[PDB]
Amino acid sequence: HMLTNLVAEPFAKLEQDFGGSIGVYAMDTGSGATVSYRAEERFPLCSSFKGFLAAAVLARSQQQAGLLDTPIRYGKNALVPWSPISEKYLTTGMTVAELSAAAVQYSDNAAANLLLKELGGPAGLTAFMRSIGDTTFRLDRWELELNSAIPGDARDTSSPRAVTESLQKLTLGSALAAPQRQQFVDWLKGNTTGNHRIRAAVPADWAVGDKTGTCGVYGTANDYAVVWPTGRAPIVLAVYTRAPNKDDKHSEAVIAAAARLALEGLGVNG
Numbered sequence: 223h224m225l226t227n228l229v230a231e232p233f234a235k236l237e238q239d240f241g242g243s244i245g246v247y248a249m250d251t252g253s254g255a256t257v258s259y260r261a262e263e264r265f266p267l268c269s270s271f272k273g274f275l276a277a278a279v280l281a282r283s284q285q286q287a288g289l290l291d292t293p294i295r296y297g298k299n300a301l302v303p304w305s306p307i308s309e310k311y312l313t314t315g316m317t318v319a320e321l322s323a324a325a326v327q328y329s330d331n332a333a334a335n336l337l338l339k340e341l342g343g344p345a346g347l348t349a350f351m352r353s354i355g356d357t358t359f360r361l362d363r364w365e366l367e368l369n370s371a372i373p374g375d376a377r378d379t380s381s382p383r384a385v386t387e388s389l390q391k392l393t394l395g396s397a398l399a400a401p402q403r404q405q406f407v408d409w410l411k412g413n414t415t416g417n418h419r420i421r422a423a424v425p426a427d428w429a430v431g432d433k434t435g436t437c438g439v440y441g442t443a444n445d446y447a448v449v450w451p452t453g454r455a456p457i458v459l460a461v462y463t464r465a466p467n468k469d470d471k472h473s474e475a476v477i478a479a480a481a482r483l484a485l486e487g488l489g490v491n492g
């Protein structure tokens with residue numbers, strides 16, 4: 223409780239300036255110290271489910287050898303907005319591994335939907351999260367309907383704490399086999415969409431992997447990350463936002479500032 227009270231006031235000021243709600247859970251994997259602010263509230267996942275989607279693909283690849291190399295062909299009707307990689311391979315197809323990398327590193331929507339289909343839809347991804355001990359995560363819909371971010375709607379949400387706990391298990395714990403774990407970390411490390419979020423709070427000499435989400439309404443956006451500071455154990459953290467009005471805009475700077483506060487609360491000199 224000590225570190226959480228250390229940062230309670232600055233978090234309240236930050237979210238009031240933002241005009242919405244900020245949810246943060248950060249875990250120092252060395253000491254076990256944690257920082258929480260609205261950490262048990264539900265926030266829309268938006269694209270952040272795509273990280274867990276790729277982890278679920280990797281988990282299945284442990285039992286289905288050759289799953290990652292399977293070519294997937296798709297039609298033009300699969301190309302929903304923000305499919306920047308898959309639109310370039312419409313005439314050729316892509317492998318499951320390439321779709322997973324595109325989903326993680328470019329937030330590719332068509333790729334995410336194609337991989338969701340392979341796993342049995344939103345319920346199949348939810349089942350995977352249940353299998354690692356996450357009872358909070360729920361995915362209910364596909365891209366782009368899952369972006370609705372309706373106030374009070376539990377569909378397609380999780381909590382910052384559950385996101386951080388599941389991310390820890392998948393990137394640092396035993397939820398994935400060692401080769402699949404490293405592949406998940408490497409995909410997160412290569413993300414291209416989060417330079418202005420948690421990464422903006424992380425010194426250049428620290429390794430970081432992240433997955434972003436941006437719903438586009440209700441001030442709703444997020445990022446989760448694993449951060450490897452030099453000389454100490456890694457930090458896992460999740461930063462989620464929402465706001466009361468549909469037209470409220472999200473703020474990357476607010477996500478970065480919340481990440482800064484979480485790291486400062488943990489005592490990690492950034």
Ligand SMILES: COc1ccc2c(CP(=O)(O)O)cc(=O)oc2c1
Pocket residue numbers: 268269270303304328329366415434435436437438
């Ligand atoms: C379809 O429209 C989209 C899809 C994704 C994005 C993303 C990528 P992500 O943050 O969800 O991962 C950032 C954004 O600003 O707008 C978006 C708009």
